[PDB]
Design a protein around this ligand. Structure first.
Ligand SMILES: [Zn+2]
Lengths: 50, 52, 200, 121, 118, 104, 82
RNA sequence: CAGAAUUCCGUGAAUCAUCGAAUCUUUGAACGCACAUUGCGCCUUUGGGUUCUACCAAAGGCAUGCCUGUUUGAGUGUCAUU
RNA sequence: GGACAUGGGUUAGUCGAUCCUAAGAGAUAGGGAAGCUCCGUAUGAAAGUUGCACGAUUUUUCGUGCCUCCUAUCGAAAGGG
RNA sequence: UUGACCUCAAAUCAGGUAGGACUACGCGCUGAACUUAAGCAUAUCAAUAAGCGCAGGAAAAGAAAAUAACCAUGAUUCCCUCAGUAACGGCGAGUGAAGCGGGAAAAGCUCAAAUUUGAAAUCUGGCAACAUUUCUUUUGUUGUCCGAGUUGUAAUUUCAA
């Protein structure tokens, strides 16, 4: 609400960083089948729950 | 404080609360002259010290 | 020695001297805390018999424990069951007040090991016990062969596990037919375990 | 890469100066990486970090060895310097304390020890 | 032994200080948060370049546990420039940035060129 | 270790002979073995059992005598056979006690 | 009234992030975590919940020091430089 | 994918294996007080800004219960020559 | 396009929090409870921070001198400031 | 006035110690109900589930205030058997051990109660020295001093004596 604690802001920063597209080279690694990921979170679909 | 109050009240309770003869036979010790004579003759026969 | 005289005099608890001493000492203990360190044992001969020694590493604590039975800690006497389990008022705690006293002293002095305890006084409300404790971190204890056993970790909170004299008395440990269920769980497990051998 | 045996032959002040220079080089490498750089120069960042770790490690051994020398044959020494076994092992009875015996037990062992014996058919 | 008050209070004792027989830690830790551990890297975004050119303020990426007192000291120790004011910002990505304005006698453009991120 | 021969304590088994826990003090004294040395040489000592009959006393005493006769006692110091030690410990081997002294 | 329109006034957190276990189970008014029992000096655990026990138990996390202890034991807890 | 020939007649590449020396952020029994706050303090030493006392920075510390000793104490508790 | 991808963006001695206390929460002493823990907040506690110069080369907060109803903290982004 | 003793305090005093996690097995406390009895209250489920306290590599138990009634056995523990037996039980449903015997393994002991009284001979801590190491990380010895201790630390004894 624009009035957030330091812990809340750090958690939001962590959530934002864990939302980026996956680089393709890691998926192309031999023996690595990361490929597509359903871990992607949208602000309007799945809430963080603090 | 508690310990000062307890020890003073203990002395009062012992002074009252009639004591059985086995314990009441105390509180009447040697007089001044007899006690100092006993200790004077006692101080000669001291049971040595570590140095000696 | 005076220890024999002390032992014989402690038996005569109904004598005038013993009754007077009990009264003044019960008042003395009631004016103190529930648990308090005793500088020296009030019954040196009893402490010696139980294992206390007048050397560094031995600690004596005096504790008063409330007397009576164990009321069922249910809110309004409601047990929510069959009538056989509806008793609330005339129930008894399976461990003795001496066991409770030594366990509370052990919690109070968790750095020490409980060795034994002995009754010293009682009234209507409280029963008074003196508990002997041994310091396992003291060198005088760690170098004494006769008390060296208690340093070992297997004797940690022996009063909590009922390994003291009164603890084993409450557990019912004994020899003979009168103690057929000496260890209750071990005996029950042996008698209720179905042994299915491979017939080959 | 910096050699540990070469680092161990230098004084603490020289090692501190080397550490400062390496940190400055690492900062410059990060600056160039941010504002455009080549993979050949970027690969030096890991080597610089490892060299910084090596210098800090060597300084640590020198400091700890000096502390051990100072606390040699002393009754009480720092907790990090002393034993690092398990907690139960540390507070367990020492072999000397466990082998302590009373005079009666010592006399019994001396006069009636277990004998070596054999039987014949 | 005359007491003019009915309340008993604990008398004052010596209360001597600690004289340890051994240091708990053998080696004192090296000072955390040094100058190289206060500055990470300069920020060379378009807004940062506008600040440098038009306002004589350098935009640096500083650690999260640094303050303006230590940022000023580190900037002085690393680039030999005396700041006049420092503003601290924490970006939504969890990292801190510092706007460090320089005095009139110092030029942020030349300082930035000396650093080498331009 | 060598064990004594005892009679089981019931009419269902009093006609048999089995192995006991240890030799009584009276048996050890009759056989000439001290209670402290019996443990050292491998003779168990049972302080609870008693010899109510000369039959049981003699039965166990002969067992101790046979064990002593067949026993080799190594000297405490090698090459210096003391009182009771054997001077011919060269031919020593591990043998079954019941193979020479079984329960009969 | 008890349903959809009543759900529109739910904007006051009852629990927040716990400082010990990190779950959003720290009751704000009671100052107690519903998951791990913080700030009580004991981790909340019950035998009727075994799935909850295995969710948060030894081996779930990093085991940074237990692995070092196991490695030290296998060599016999030796010290010094060869 | 590269990069690395500062590599190979070399105490040397590797997300290799082993592993006895170290590093080990904020926390957590968690321990200066708290914490829906990266909030509020205290002590010692060393340095920077005019600062023998204020401010800043760094290093080392400040929880409770209990044990054995140390020091300083209290008591119309018991005892002696002054 | 509030979608997807790549980058950028939140700058305080003066705005709030931080300070205080409210309803309340909650340590400590002490007392219960087999115990997890419950009651309790100057409570039946030896619960101590403030005030003068006694000594000091000399124009100054440290060793003592007898004090006197001080007192844990948390608790408001709409209360006070 | 002082010292000594006794009791009780304070210190960020010197050195230590406890908490917490793991619970398959182990030692205890507390403790149901579903269910069976073709209903149901005693009983059964069960001295169990849940709750609480406490250890180790095992724990507990353990060297008879034990059995037996015999030609007597002989610490504890575990397996077979005793035995679905003696016995308990609205004698309803159901519950239910122990001695002996065979085997696995075997190991014994320690204090308090004694006057050393021709010598507290006992122990901790500080300091210093000398040794030792799974190890500069561990463990000791000697000397000296201070404390503990005569309201009893050492030695011979523990009933088998
Ligand atoms: Zn939690």
């Amino acid at each position: 609400p624009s009035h957030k604690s330091f812990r809340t802001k750090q958690k939001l920063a962590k959530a934002a960083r864990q939302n980026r597209p996956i680089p393709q080279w890691i998926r192309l690694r031999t023996g690595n089948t990361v490929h597509y990921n359903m871990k992607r979170r949208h602000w309007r679909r799945t809430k963080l729950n603090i | 404080p508690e310990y000062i109050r307890l020890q003073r009240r203990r002395k009062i309770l012992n002074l009252r609360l009639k004591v059985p003869p086995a314990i009441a036979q105390f509180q009447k010790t040697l007089d001044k002259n007899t006690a100092t004579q006993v200790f004077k003759l006692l101080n000669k026969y001291r049971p040595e010290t570590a140095a000696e | 020695g005076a220890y024999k005289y002390l032992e014989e005099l402690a038996k005569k608890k109904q004598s005038d001297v013993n009754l007077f001493l009990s009264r003044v000492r019960a008042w003395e203990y009631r004016q103190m805390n529930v648990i308090h360190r005793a500088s020296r044992p009030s019954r040196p001969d009893k402490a010696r018999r139980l294992g206390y020694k007048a050397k560094q590493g031995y600690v004596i604590y005096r504790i008063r424990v409330r007397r009576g039975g164990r009321k069922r800690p249910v809110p309004k006497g409601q047990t929510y069951g069959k009538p056989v389990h509806q008793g609330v008022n005339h129930l008894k705690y399976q461990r003795s007040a001496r066991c409770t006293a030594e366990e509370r002293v052990g919690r109070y002095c968790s750095n020490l090991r409980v060795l034994n305890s002995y009754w010293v006084n009682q009234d209507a409300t409280y029963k008074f016990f003196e508990v002997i404790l041994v310091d396992p971190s003291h060198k005088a204890i760690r170098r004494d062969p006769r008390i060296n056993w208690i340093v070992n970790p297997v004797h940690k909170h022996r009063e909590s596990r009922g390994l003291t004299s009164i603890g084993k008395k409450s557990r019912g440990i004994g020899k003979g037919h009168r103690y057929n269920n000496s260890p209750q769980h071990a005996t029950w497990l042996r008698h209720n375990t179905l042994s299915l051998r491979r017939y080959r | 890469a910096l050699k540990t045996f070469e680092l161990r032959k230098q004084s603490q002040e020289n090692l501190a100066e080397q550490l400062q220079e390496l940190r400055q080089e690492l900062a410059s490498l990060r600056v160039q990486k941010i504002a455009g750089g080549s993979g050949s120069k970027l690969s030096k960042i890991k080597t610089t970090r490892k060299d910084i770790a090596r210098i800090l490690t060597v300084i640590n051994e020198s400091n700890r060895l000096a502390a051990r020398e100072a606390y040699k044959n002393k009754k009480y020494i720092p907790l990090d310097l002393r034993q690092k076994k398990t907690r139960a092992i540390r507070r367990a009875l020492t072999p000397y304390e466990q082998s302590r015996k009373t005079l009666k037990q010592i006399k019994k062992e001396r006069y009636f020890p277990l004998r070596k014996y054999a039987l014949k058919a | 032994k005359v007491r003019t008050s009915t309340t008993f209070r604990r008398p004052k004792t010596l209360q001597l200080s600690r004289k340890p027989k051994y240091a708990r830690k053998s080696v004192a830790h090296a000072p955390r948060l040094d100058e190289y551990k206060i500055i990470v890297n300069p920020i060379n975004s378009e807004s940062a370049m506008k600040k440098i050119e038009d306002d004589n303020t350098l935009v640096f990426h500083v650690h999260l546990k640094a303050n303006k007192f230590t940022i000023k000291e580190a900037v002085r120790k690393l680039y030999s420039v005396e700041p006049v004011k420092i503003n601290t910002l924490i970006r939504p990505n969890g990292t801190k940035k510092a706007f460090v304005k320089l005095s009139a006698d110092a030029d942020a453009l030349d300082v930035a060129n000396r650093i080498g991120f331009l | 270790a060598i064990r004594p021969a005892v009679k089981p304590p019931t009419i269902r088994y009093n006609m048999k002979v089995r192995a006991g826990r240890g030799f009584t003090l009276e048996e050890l004294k009759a056989a000439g073995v001290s209670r402290r040395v019996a443990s050292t040489i491998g003779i168990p000592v049972d302080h609870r059992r008693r010899n109510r009959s000369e039959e049981s006393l003699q039965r166990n005493v002969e067992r101790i005598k046979v064990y002593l006769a067949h026993l080799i006692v190594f000297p405490r110091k090698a090459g210096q056979p003391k009182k009771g030690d054997a001077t011919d410990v060269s031919g020593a081997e591990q043998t079954d006690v019941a193979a020479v002294l079984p329960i009969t | 009234t008890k349903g959809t329109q009543s759900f529109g006034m739910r904007h006051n957190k009852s629990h927040t992030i716990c400082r010990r276990c990190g779950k959003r189970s720290f009751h704000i008014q009671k100052s107690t975590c519903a998951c791990c029992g913080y700030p009580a000096a004991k981790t909340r655990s019950y035998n009727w919940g075994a799935k909850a026990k295995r969710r948060r138990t030894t081996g779930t996390g990093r085991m940074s020091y237990l692995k070092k202890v196991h490695r030290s034991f296998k060599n016999g807890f030796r010290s010094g430089k060869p």
